[PDB]
Amino acid sequence: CPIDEAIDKKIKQDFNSLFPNAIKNIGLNCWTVSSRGKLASCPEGTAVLSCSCGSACGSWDIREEKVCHCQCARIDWTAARCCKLQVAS
Amino acid sequence: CPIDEAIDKKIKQDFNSLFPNAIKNIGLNCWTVSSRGKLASCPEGTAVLSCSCGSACGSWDIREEKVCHCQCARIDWTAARCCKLQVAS
Amino acid sequence: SSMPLCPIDEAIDKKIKQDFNSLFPNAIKNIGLNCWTVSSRGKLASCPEGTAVLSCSCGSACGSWDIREEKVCHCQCARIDWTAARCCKLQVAS
Numbered sequence A, B: 001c002p003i004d005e006a007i008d009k010k011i012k013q014d015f016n017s018l019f020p021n022a023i024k025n026i027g028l029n030c031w032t033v034s035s036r037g038k039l040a041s042c043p044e045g046t047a048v049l050s051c052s053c054g055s056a057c058g059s060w061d062i063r064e065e066k067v068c069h070c071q072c073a074r075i076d077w078t079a080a081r082c083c084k085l086q087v088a089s
Numbered sequence C: 001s002s003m004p005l006c007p008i009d010e011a012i013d014k015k016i017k018q019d020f021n022s023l024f025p026n027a028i029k030n031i032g033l034n035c036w037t038v039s040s041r042g043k044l045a046s047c048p049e050g051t052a053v054l055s056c057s058c059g060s061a062c063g064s065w066d067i068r069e070e071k072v073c074h075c076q077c078a079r080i081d082w083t084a085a086r087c088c089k090l091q092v093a094s
Helices: A004-024 B003-023 C007-028
Strands: A026-036 A039-041 A047-053 A060-063 A067-070 A077-087 B026-036 B039-041 B047-053 B060-063 B067-070 B077-087 C031-041 C044-046 C052-058 C065-068 C072-075 C082-092
Touching: A004 A026, A004 B003, A004 C007, A004 C082, A026 A039, A026 C052, A026 C082, A047 A060, A047 A067, A047 B026, A047 B047, A047 B077, A047 C052, A067 A077, A077 B003, A077 B026, A077 C052, B003 C007, B026 B039, B047 B060, B047 B067, B047 C031, B047 C052, B047 C082, B067 B077, B077 C007, B077 C031, C031 C044, C052 C065, C052 C072, C072 C082
Parallel strands: A039 A077, B039 B077, C044 C082
Antiparallel strands: A026 A077, A039 A067, A047 A077, A060 A067, B026 B077, B039 B067, B047 B077, B060 B067, C031 C082, C044 C072, C052 C082, C065 C072
16 A cells, blocks of 8 residues: 555654654743632633632632632632643744 | 655645644643642642642642642641643544 | 545645544643742742743741742742742653
């Protein structure tokens, strides 16, 4: 099957040379969303990677893989770290 | 080195459009592993991105890039944020 | 297809696309998150160029931090023993 045999090999070769380059060209795009009160939400299309809280509060949980909730009493602000991937080119 | 050059060009061209398409189809898949006590670990194939602690404790460290360790004397629970890449297709 | 005007070019195009559709997912298994922590005495810890800051930790039980310029973890409480930044990048498994 010589041609369809060889074309596929050239595709595999070409792909292998160019994939890792195309993977180094993508990055993590992260920003913070902060709100007064006990909740801060990441937008659709992003993941929540961490939370931060005012008033020294280290105790948080993430609700529905979207919303940072700070647990301590009378919290003044909540912040979520939101990330998605970005092609840098 | 003729017909192979034309084919090489077509492979590279198709790759340049398919690469970005397929990469933006990948997101971060994150979840939380919690435990009573001062340690919570992420499973094989995941990275640890952050930790949370009970008792308002904001002091933590990650051991062996796997285990969240909450450092305060008082710790009711420990939580790790664990992530890996995920095709959303 | 539907009556290819360039039969060979189209046959090859479809082979390229088909191949990419198997080559890509198998190649993507080999890429992951390279994360580490950068720690410092004082109130600031920064991540190096080419990485993102994902979270911060503070000494003295302080849970209040902010990231400056998407590079520097800042612990906000009045007294802080130390500051740590969680830094990550995407990376091909070599």
